Structure formats: structure tokens, C-alpha cells
Design a protein around this ligand. Sequence first.
Ligand SMILES: N[C@@H]1[C@@H](O)[C@H](O)[C@@H](CO)O[C@@H]1O
Length: 321
Amino acid sequence: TKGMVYYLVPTLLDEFQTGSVNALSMFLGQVGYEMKTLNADNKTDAQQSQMNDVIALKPAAIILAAVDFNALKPSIEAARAAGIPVVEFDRQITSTPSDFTSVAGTVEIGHIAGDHAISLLKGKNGDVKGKILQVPGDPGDPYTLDIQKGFEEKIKAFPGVKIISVPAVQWEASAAGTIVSDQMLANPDIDLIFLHAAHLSVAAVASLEAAGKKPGDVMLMSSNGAPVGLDLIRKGWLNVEVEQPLYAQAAAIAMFMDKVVGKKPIKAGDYDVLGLKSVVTMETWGPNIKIPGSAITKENVDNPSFWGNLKPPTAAIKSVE
Ligand SMILES: N[C@@H]1[C@@H](O)[C@H](O)[C@@H](CO)O[C@@H]1O
């Protein structure tokens, strides 16, 4: 064994989070690290306390996905000062250095979602008009902040589309259900609802159903690729799911961990991570790998490369030498 790695996961409340524990644990194990997971259960002060605890344990590395991206900056600094490598998973922290960061191309995921919304709202006469209800996730999470930026950039170019945006605080599907019910009663002309993770869409479907809607009446889209999302595609409720590449983000951390722990430089460039072109840059917050997401529709929903089909790579993750 090469040592222990602590993963500070923000919650265990959807398939991405629990999937990330499983993938990081398995992949790191393939490259000779034992992973231990601590769950913040959506409490910032818990995760901050967990950081102190783990710093005291002096592990080979810490993997953090911050509950709140502004709140954790001091903890990151403390860990690194104690000589412990810190890796950011999924939730990008740009305001202080980390030793590695592994994220989806989130602005690009918002762009893809934007392109599909536009396509979905384009009318017979070539114009783009309608009303979109957008349901971001928690404001403390750069994943949704950056998807929102990309999405809005696309949609704003077509001012005949009105957009209503209401975040689901703490990523709660229950909030999303309330939002969809209240907003649809006030705006019967909502044509499309874009939610930033598929577990939110599950609540949206129930809210639509309770208002008498059937699959396809209101177009629906979400943006993380979770299994419940792909199942809503198959059932006709969801028009599009723009996945983030969970397995690849996890695999990349395992692939580069020897370099992180060895304090060896991580060279900028294009890498293959589980078949995806993954881009490493040197940023002010340290080495960063950005891995692309993809749009999933009924036409390609069964592609085993998409993590919501729960067919992880068969072959050995290997350390980057
Ligand atoms: N990128 C992840 C999503 O996949 C996930 O749904 C939320 C909530 O767990 O956290 C992060 O934002």
C-alpha cells in the first residue's frame, strides 16, 4: 500500500455522490491507495471540522468536494501548510492553490444544454421563443454556478425566450418539486424546465404529473447524467440529459495520485481518461484536468460509456508515470 487517502464528500444524497465514493475507492485501490470517506451531510461546519480531524491524521492525500466553495479556503490552506496534498474533486476552488483538481467542463455542459434548449424551442417559422424554468442547484457549488453561466450565455442570445431561475437550495429535490409546482401555476406557458441534476428532475416529473401532465407535455432536461435521469429519458419524460463524466473525473484523480503524493509536476496537455480527451492546464489554483460531458437523448441513452448506465471500465486504472 502507498498510504491512505481521505475523501471528504459533501453528501451521500444522490447517485453521483454515492457513485463518486465507489469509483474513487475502487480506482484508488487499483493504484495502491486505501480510501476512507467522511460525509459532511451538507453541513459546512461539519466538513471544516472533518478537515481538521484528517489534517491531524496526516494521510497521504485529501480529496475534497466542498459543501461551500468560499467556506473551505482556509482548511485547504491549513492542510497544505501541514504538508498534506489536497485534491479538489468535481467542485472547483479557484481562490487558493490545490495540488490537483478534477472537474467536468461545466461551462461547456451549460452550453450543450443551451444548444438543446434552443433546438427544442425553435418554432416552425425559424424563431426561438418561449419560457424556460431553470432550477440550479445549491449556490455554494461551482458545478451548478458554472453550468448556469454557460446555459444563460446561450439562451440570452434569443430574447424571445423568457427565463425564470430558482435554485434548489442544498441540491434538494424537495425544493425542486415545490419550485416546479409554484412556478408552473404562475406560468402555465413554461415550455421547458432545465434542472441541474437528474435527481431534481425526478421531483419535477412528480410535480408535473400532479398537475395532470404526461411525458412530453413540458420539455425537460437535466445536467449530471445520473441513472434516474437516463431512466426518465427512456420513459419519455426527459428530452435530454447532459452528463458529467463521473467515472473519468474519478479515474483521473487515481491516475495522477502518485504524482500528487510524490510532489512531481503534472505536465499540461491532452490526456486519455477512460476514452475522453481530458485537458490538463496549469492554473493559479494548481494543475487542473477538465473532462467533457455529453448530451444524452433517447437515441444514444444505452451507450455504455455514459456513467448512468453503471458500466464502469473493465480495465485496470494505471498510474501516470
Ligand atoms: N456535480 C455534482 C452533481 O452531480 C450532484 O447532483 C450534486 C448534488 O449531489 O453535487 C454536484 O454538483
